[PDB]
């Protein structure tokens, strides 16, 4: 038996299918037992049994190609994926993580670890484009799935693979982390739109770690502030967790609970 898997297809995707998919993903990410100021906390990496460490997301498209992404439950972030007979992993940041990912796709005949990490800075560099310039929506995700699949046949060049990772991470991992970002993807489906993320989304993505800390270290929710951006790119400060309730869906574990 196995890590949990959640399925989603871009083919005939609707606001409802996407929403229910993201909700299912969150359910496999947090236990529901650690909630702080109403925001769920992800499992603490320290002491976490390896059989609890990962979940799989099976993505398919209208071209009928499928890939499975692996997400780390401790951060909701993509550590690698499988297509056909091969799995591909980002370079791990430490030896524990390096050891953890060896328990993924153990079924697969070929397992490759990239020489680079999966952080946006590295991926933007490999892609030769910023998040600001990379459109998101069902169309881009449909195409990103094909690109990841054909990486495994040699049909996808590295910069396109980087760009496709940038799309997948945002529409899956960041959507899972932030209701606000799930909402941004919902709207794109509703209107059949593809468009790049605006500054509001980019700053939340960049800030997810800092927000997790501020929230967990707050006095009854009051921060010891975090600067975000509005959609027009103007700066605003968050002082308190209350405003973030509709915004941030889960947090990386920082400190012991109340």
């Amino acid at each position, epitope marked *: 038996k196995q890590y949990p898997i959640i399925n989603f297809t871009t083919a005939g995707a609707t606001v409802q299918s996407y929403t229910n998919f993201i909700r299912a993903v969150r359910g496999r990410l947090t236990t529901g037992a650690d909630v702080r100021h109403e925001i769920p906390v992800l499992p603490n990496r320290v002491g976490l049994p390896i059989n609890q460490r990962f979940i799989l997301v099976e993505l398919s498209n209208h071209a009928e190609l499928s890939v499975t992404l692996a997400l780390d439950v401790t951060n909701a972030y993509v550590v690698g994926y499988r297509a056909g007979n091969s799995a591909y992993f980002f370079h791990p940041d430490n030896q524990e993580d390096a050891e953890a990912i060896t328990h993924l796709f153990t079924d697969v005949q070929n397992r490759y670890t990239f020489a680079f990490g999966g952080n946006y800075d590295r991926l933007e560099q490999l892609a030769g484009n910023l998040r600001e310039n990379i459109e998101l929506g069902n169309g881009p995700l449909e195409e990103a799935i094909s690109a990841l699949y054909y990486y495994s046949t040699g049909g996808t060049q590295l910069p396109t693979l980087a760009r496709s990772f940038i799309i997948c991470i945002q529409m899956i991992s960041e959507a899972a982390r932030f209701q606000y970002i799930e909402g941004e993807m919902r709207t794109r489906i509703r209107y059949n739109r593809r468009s790049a993320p605006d500054p509001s989304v980019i700053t939340l993505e960049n800030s997810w770690g800092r927000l997790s800390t501020a929230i967990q270290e707050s006095n009854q929710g009051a921060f010891a502030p975090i600067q975000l951006q*509005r959609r027009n790119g103007s700066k*605003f400060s968050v002082y308190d967790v209350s405003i973030l309730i509709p915004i941030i869906a889960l947090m990386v574990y920082r400190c012991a609970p109340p």
Partner: nanobody, 120 residues
């Protein structure tokens, strides 16, 4: 629990100058737009000067180059410097503030109760 506090106004000589100030409390977030509208008696209320969170200002054509608005986002305050006062400027001035999304609101808008400026 938004509250606007307006200061300034009163009787002033033609050619003089004064300052209006407005400070919003009870907004957990900074204003989207803040500024003044005025209503001259027998007239419709009209925009005078507003400023945005981006610090962009908008003025009535008739006060442009006479009035200056400035703002402080972090304190949710705006100030209107009124120079070269003219008869047309006699009116009740109303502070207005609008705020964008913060839970549980998508937005809100707020009016002051007005302060009269009378040019003698």
């Amino acid at each position: 629990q938004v509250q606007l506090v307006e200061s300034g106004g009163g009787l002033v000589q033609a050619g003089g100058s004064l300052r209006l100030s407005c400070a919003a409390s009870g907004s957990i977030v900074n204003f989207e737009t803040m500024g003044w509208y005025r209503q001259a008696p027998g007239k419709e209320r009209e925009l005078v000067a507003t400023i945005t969170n981006e610090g962009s200002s908008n003025y009535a054509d008739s006060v442009k180059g006479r009035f200056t608005i400035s703002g402080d986002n972090a304190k949710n305050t705006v100030s209107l410097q009124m120079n070269s006062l003219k008869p047309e400027d006699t009116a009740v001035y109303y502070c207005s503030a609008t705020f964008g999304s913060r839970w549980p609101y998508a937005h809100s808008d707020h009016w002051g109760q007005g302060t009269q400026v009378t040019v003698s």
